[PDB]
Write a protein that binds this ligand. Structure first.
Ligand SMILES: CC1=C(/C=C/C(C)=C/C=C/C(C)=C/C=C/C=C(C)/C=C/C=C(C)/C=C/C2=C(C)C(=O)CCC2(C)C)C(C)(C)CCC1=O
Ligand SMILES: [Cl-]
Length: 313
């Protein structure tokens, strides 16, 4: 008697940074022009100390057409297209944007940000003043750990556009070939020698998604931070290929415990780096694995932890 939804409760002591979804919820109530101005301010300040990596060439080619169209617009239509995105309005641009994977959306906005700084796309009005709720939301963001700040930014970007009733076409970056076997690193985890867990981390660090997916049970699931579980090999594999490329998992230590019915539950804590920021932002992460008797992954959750004080010991 162990289901995906019940497995979500293992290691319930684990204190996730639920300020992140809380802040996204407050952010999403705001006026669209405040949403845009708020991210503009946060992004400008964050950039004084955090350098964002340039978008990949393939991603920028996929966003090029939409970026060209916006550039050909007059300033008022440019501002209107950005508000449409933030409002999740139903427009052709908003539907194109909603078909994109997160990295393509992120590179789209990265490039609009550069063009706004250069004055080639309508900027945020000079001297713009946020609303009462918006100033408070921005203050909250600026008080978070950098790992939490960039999660808020990405989740806000992913939220934009019109994805209503959208199980249709998905546009994503091409799949990078797995790291050659001779150059792959091998993680070490204090306390944890489980082969499934170590192979999980090593294969993801090598972008070896075909090998990684075979560690899962047919009906197994993966739960990203603050998102519902992704269920089944088909869906988990799609997620890997479209959204999980070029991560760096740096686990540190863990604990291994029996679970009901010859299962095993393992919790590991450490850091994860996104290619957007590399070593400049280390996110505090827990991994919560539920393995069946054969060692297959029935459930794995990845949690963004509330602070470094939540890392094991
Ligand atoms: C929008 C906008 C702007 C632009 C703003 C811009 C350019 C914003 C860009 C912000 C960027 C690029 C943020 C990068 C975020 C990446 C994160 C949080 C990834 C974490 C990865 C994790 C947790 C991986 C976890 C994983 C592990 C380890 C697994 O083991 C399994 C897989 C899994 C994935 C779960 C302007 C500046 C133009 C202003 C207007 C405006 O609105
Ligand atoms: Cl990423």
């Amino acid at each position: 008697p162990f289901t995906i939804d019940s497995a979500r409760g293992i290691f319930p002591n684990t204190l996730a940074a639920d300020v992140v979804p809380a802040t996204i919820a407050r952010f999403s109530q705001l006026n669209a022009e405040d949403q845009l101005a708020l991210i503009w301010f946060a992004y400008l300040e964050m950039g004084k100390t955090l350098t964002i990596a340039a978008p990949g060439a393939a991603s920028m080619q996929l966003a090029e057409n939409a970026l060209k169209e916006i550039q050909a617009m007059g300033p008022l239509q440019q501002t209107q297209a950005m508000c449409d995105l933030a409002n999740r309005a139903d427009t052709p641009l908003c539907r194109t944007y909603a078909s994109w994977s997160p990295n393509i959306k992120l590179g789209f906005w990265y490039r609009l940000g550069e063009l706004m700084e250069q004055g080639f796309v309508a900027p945020i009005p000079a001297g713009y003043q946020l609303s009462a709720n918006a100033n408070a939301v921005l203050a909250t963001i600026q008080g978070l750990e950098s790992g939490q700040q960039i999660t808020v930014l990405r989740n806000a970007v992913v939220d934009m556009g019109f994805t209503a009733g959208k199980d249709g076409k998905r546009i994503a970056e091409p799949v990078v070939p797995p790291q050659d076997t001779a150059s792959r690193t091998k993680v070490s985890i204090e306390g944890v020698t489980n082969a499934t867990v170590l192979n999980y981390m090593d294969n993801l660090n090598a972008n070896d998604f075909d090998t990684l997916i075979e560690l899962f049970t047919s009906d197994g699931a993966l739960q990203p931070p603050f998102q519902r579980p992704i269920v089944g090999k088909e869906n988990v594999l799609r997620f890997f290929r479209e959204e999980c490329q070029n991560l760096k998992l740096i686990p540190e230590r863990g604990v291994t415990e029996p679970a009901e019915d010859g299962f095993t539950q393992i919790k590991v804590t450490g850091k994860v780096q996104t290619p957007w920021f590399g070593g400049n932002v280390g996110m505090n992460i827990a991994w919560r694995f539920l393995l069946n008797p054969e060692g297959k992954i029935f459930f794995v959750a990845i949690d963004l932890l509330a602070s470094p004080k939540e890392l094991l010991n």
